[PDB]
Design a protein around this ligand. Sequence first.
Ligand code: CLA
Ligand code: CLA
Ligand SMILES: CC1=C(C#C/C(C)=C/C=C/C(C)=C/C=C/C=C(C)/C=C/C=C(\C)C#CC2=C(C)C[C@@H](O)CC2(C)C)C(C)(C)C[C@H](O)C1
Ligand SMILES: CC1=C(C#C/C(C)=C/C=C/C(C)=C/C=C/C=C(C)/C=C/C=C(C)/C=C/C2=C(C)CCCC2(C)C)C(C)(C)C[C@H](O)C1
Ligand SMILES: CCCCCCCCCCCCO[C@H]1O[C@H](CO)[C@@H](O[C@H]2O[C@H](CO)[C@@H](O)[C@H](O)[C@H]2O)[C@H](O)[C@H]1O
Lengths: 180, 180, 168, 160, 42, 35
Amino acid sequence: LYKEGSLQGKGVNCIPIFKRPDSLKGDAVGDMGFDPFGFSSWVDMNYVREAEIKHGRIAMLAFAGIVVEVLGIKAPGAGKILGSSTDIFEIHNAAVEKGSMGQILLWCGFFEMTAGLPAMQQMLEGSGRTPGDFGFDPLGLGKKDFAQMQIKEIQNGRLAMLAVSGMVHHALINGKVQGL
Amino acid sequence: EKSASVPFLSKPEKLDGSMAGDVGFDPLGISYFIDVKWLREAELKHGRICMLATAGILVQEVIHLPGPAFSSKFALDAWSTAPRGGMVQILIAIGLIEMVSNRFAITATDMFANPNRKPGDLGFDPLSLGANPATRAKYELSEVIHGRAAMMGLSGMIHQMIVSKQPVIDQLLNFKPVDA
Amino acid sequence: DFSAAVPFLKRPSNLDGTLAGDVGFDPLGFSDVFDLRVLREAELKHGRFAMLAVLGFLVQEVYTFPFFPKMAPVDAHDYFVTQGGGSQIIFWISFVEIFGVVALFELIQGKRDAGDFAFDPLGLGKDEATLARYKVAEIKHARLAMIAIGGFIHQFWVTKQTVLEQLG
Amino acid sequence: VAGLTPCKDSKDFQRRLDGSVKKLKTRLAKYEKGTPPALALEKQIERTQARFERYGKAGLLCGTDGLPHLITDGRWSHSGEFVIPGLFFLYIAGWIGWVGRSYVLFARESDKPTEKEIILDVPAALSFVSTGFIWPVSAFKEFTSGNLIADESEITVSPR
Amino acid sequence: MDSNFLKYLSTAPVLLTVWLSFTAGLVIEANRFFPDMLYFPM
Amino acid sequence: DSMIVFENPLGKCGAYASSCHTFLDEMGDMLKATP
Ligand code: CLA
Ligand code: CLA
Ligand SMILES: CC1=C(C#C/C(C)=C/C=C/C(C)=C/C=C/C=C(C)/C=C/C=C(\C)C#CC2=C(C)C[C@@H](O)CC2(C)C)C(C)(C)C[C@H](O)C1
Ligand SMILES: CC1=C(C#C/C(C)=C/C=C/C(C)=C/C=C/C=C(C)/C=C/C=C(C)/C=C/C2=C(C)CCCC2(C)C)C(C)(C)C[C@H](O)C1
Ligand SMILES: CCCCCCCCCCCCO[C@H]1O[C@H](CO)[C@@H](O[C@H]2O[C@H](CO)[C@@H](O)[C@H](O)[C@H]2O)[C@H](O)[C@H]1O
């Protein structure tokens, strides 16, 4: 683990209010001694870590997308077909109507079924695959410090999860994702 | 000492975990007085019939055999509209199938007289998909879970159709909450 | 001996103080003729119902679901009796109580502790000291809420006023 | 038609229906509309009318008295009157007898047959109850295998 | 449940009463939902 | 003359915000309902 004992691992507690559960053994990336409800006792650690990485990645992509939608940057021809609305919910409904979101759903589900499900099953059966690993490093950015990249990815994904949730609810309240 | 599914109740003694789908769920203790072989045979038969029932209720709403007799999206109406002679033929064929598949051993006193007879094993493997020991256990667990899920789904479908008086897909697409 | 709770009353023989919230209070001697474990299960079931009922009263007074008519908690009973939601709640409570019967038989057989359904989803009672403190707190709150729910309902019947509105 | 008239076109049957309905309506006239007695009497009238209509359409034959009569001779046009009901009975009765005999033998081969007969072994009893559904082939199989009929020299008999 | 209590339920009169009550309920409900059946419908 | 009949169940319905009132539409309307 990158910065083991300081940033992550055994004996690390991001929130000292809650005691580091013994189940958190510091072997998983992103382990900062936060599990007050002690889910780690019964849950499957590899499955839950893969779920965390997936959620974080989707949240990061969603933050980027919502932001470009609110800023009004649209691909050539997107406005004519879907519309000029900046509201995320209106854009979602319009894209569902046209068929864009349906195709995205189809291909995301195909990728899930063919890659994530077999990979997750093999990992849980003991393939030794690192959670959230698909070999997708075409640009080779992770070869220098793979552990550092892993921790950075997990933390950025968590922050993006919280940010996307906040933005959606701000858009609900005020109509603005900034919710300034 | 305690059942896995229901922690506060003790583990059912007759359920030793050998059978697929065994989570120690027998709160009423049927297995104490009824042979688990008979119970599992009945469970698999019910699950298979309900698998087929759910598939049929969902499919014959969209695809029908030619003819006004077979043209009925509502399944309870199809029960009555389909040719009565044909339905009686299906009943007789099911009876003959039970007899031959069980090899004249169709009673609680003689069903498992042969030691080779295993619960739910009727010699049905036309394509020999179950000859692989590695996947046999997974297939057995999948069959049991599918039977259970299909039983619950078929019950829900039948009674929601009693209530709404509309097909399952038609109900879900044009839902109308219950009023008297 | 003399009960700790009541100095002038003899400590009931069955009540040895092992159970949580046992202060030797049993003037009418129900424990002498009935199983203390069964009585404790009844006590904790009653107390849990009463605590959830108090919380339900308060939360219903402050908030009601958008899809349900707004009304006082007591009137909600008679409304849902006709509506059919009360029937569903009764049916599902009965469904859980069917397994409760098996749990009670196991308690009689001595396999289970009265009121112990192994229900700790959030794992808040892993350490013993905390577990015993929590059990004492649970029985205390159970009794207090059993009193408080009767107080709430009777006060509503008298004043025809929700408790929150009455307190002002 | 055999010796009587169809009940669907019998003045006697119609008169009986009219009399029953008129009795019910006279009883109903003394009760306020919407009250439980009025609802009960209206439901009785509906049930009477439905019963008479169904009997008329069933093809039952009715005599001069205006009441349906049963032709229990074997005629297939009137099988539903005695034969098919009789077949259902025979099925159920043979079921009961077969399972009872099976349980008797089961208790006979036990440590305390009398105890098994007063305090039953309901798991085995339910087993036999389930077995009882193919009692015709099972009973005939027993007969042909010789496990049903006992020999004359193995049954106690009084002296002549 | 106590095995002795279960044996007491298995005793002949209890079983006869329960079985005949179940049969009476079966017949009563059959006549409640399909009344006045003087014949097998054909 | 005697051919399998395929009937489209969807018609012109959508899971949400459609002309037909779906189960999801019912849940949404109840959540946004006004007493
Ligand atoms: C539509 C296709 C599809 C499929 C097959 C999957 C599959 C999966 N997703 Mg999901 N996912 C999808 C689309 C899909 N996803 C989309 C579009 C998104 C948003 C972009 C996500 C976002 C997402 C996240 C964020 C996470 C998942 C997770 C998972 C995994 C756990 C769920 C599971 O096994 O349920 C299978 C079902 C059961 C175990 C039992 C319930 C049975 C239900 C009721 C029926 C399932 C019907 C099925 C999904 C319909 C499609 C069938 C078709 C492919 C033939 C699994 C690999 C979680 C995970 O652990 O990933 C590693 C996770 O964290 N997904
Ligand atoms: C709702 C109407 C009704 C009712 C309440 C009854 C009631 C009764 N019937 Mg039944 N019965 C009915 C309709 C009805 N019957 C009809 C429609 C028919 C015409 C088929 C019969 C024909 C019939 C017969 C032939 C006999 C009865 C007998 C009885 C009595 C004892 C049954 C018994 O012990 O079963 C429990 C079962 C057993 C103890 C097993 C042995 C007896 C059964 C009936 C054998 C069945 C299979 C056997 C192979 C049939 C051969 C018949 C042949 C010799 C004619 C009982 C009071 C029996 C009786 O009165 O005995 C003195 C009797 O022997 N009934
Ligand atoms: C074995 C074998 C073979 C085989 C085979 C075959 C033919 C296998 C067939 C398997 C099938 C048809 C399985 C079907 C499962 C259905 C399920 C679980 C339904 C669940 C429904 C639910 C939960 C629901 C619901 C619902 C309800 C109630 C309310 C609704 O508002 C919503 C909803 C609809 C969701 C072959 C022939 C290949 C040979 C091989 O050698 C051996
Ligand atoms: C009727 C009905 C309903 C209902 C209902 C319901 C839920 C009714 C519930 C009624 C309840 C819970 C009454 C409780 C009474 C408690 C008393 C008197 C406690 C006394 C304690 C004492 C004196 C303690 C003393 C204490 C002791 C012993 C020891 C310590 C010291 C001391 C303080 C002295 C509805 C709402 C559904 C409506 C529907 O139409 C039908
Ligand atoms: C192939 C030779 C096999 C020989 C063994 C046959 C033994 C038993 C045959 C029983 C008679 C067949 O049963 C039959 O009666 C029903 C009475 O409603 C018929 O009912 C229907 O049949 C025809 C269509 O198929 C229609 O034109 C009839 O108007 C209609 O009544 C069914 O066609 C069939 O179920």
